[PDB]
Chain length 154, copies 2
């Protein structure tokens, strides 16, 4: 009924192709849980997403953390909802990949090394002790930090 | 270059065009709450989604309930997790649109009129009293019932 149906039919073969390319990479559904966004980070980066420890691994076995924001909607990257020195002990070991989307398109990707995040890890750990051993619910990493301190891979 | 990264570059034109289309119809992000699936139903059917109540409306102001099924994963449409006689009363007023997907593609759409579903509203309202005012967790309408009782739009 919407004449936009012509358009849909025109478009549809290419949406299915884009979804075949996501299946190839471990994403079952492009239209659910930002699946079609994530495929753009995996294809530019060459990463492979890991199932539900870290989130991605490259060809050489290096694991990474992978955090995303839509910059229209927000300016800080989330980390973990209940962090403590043991989450930080895990976080201390790997580089982090930070993907910035604007809408459905990736706008930029940054890589930060553990040395670039010791700032917040020391601070968070201190704060878990000074607040009497209570878990910090999702501290955030400002976009300006990651853009000051990282390597722009895209 | 990169073989898959060539495909992103070749396909992304058409993904952006499909998202622009979805904005025209009130879906903000095709990759998030099955928004790329729901757009298919709204261009075929010509309906307009509502917020919060029933799911959609035609130009004449008739309202519809709208239910979907991935035919690869299940064989019954869900209803409402807390089924009770007041929910049923809202339900009896509107036609339901059932859309059947295989994966991310729409395969079929049926419309049932309240008379076509009175069968179930009865059984459900009676059960509520008989099992002592106890709400029903999400009763299911069998796909066979809808292929047999409703009109096939698509």
């Amino acid at each position: 009924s919407h004449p936009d149906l012509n358009k849909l039919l025109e478009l549809w073969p290419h949406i299915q192709e884009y979804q075949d390319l996501a299946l190839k990479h471990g994403i079952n559904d492009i239209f659910q849980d930002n699946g079609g966004k994530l495929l753009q980070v995996l294809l530019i980066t060459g990463l492979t997403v890991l199932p539900g420890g870290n989130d991605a691994v490259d060809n050489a076995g290096q694991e990474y953390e992978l955090k995303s924001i839509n910059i229209d909607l927000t300016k800080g990257f989330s980390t973990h909802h209940h962090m403590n020195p043991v989450i930080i002990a895990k976080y201390r070991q790997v580089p982090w990949i930070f993907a910035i989307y604007r809408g459905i398109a990736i706008e930029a990707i940054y890589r930060l090394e553990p040395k670039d995040l010791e700032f917040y890890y020391d601070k968070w750990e201190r704060k878990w002790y000074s607040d009497g051993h209570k878990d910090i619910n999702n501290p955030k990493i400002p976009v300006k930090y990651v853009m000051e301190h990282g390597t722009k891979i895209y």
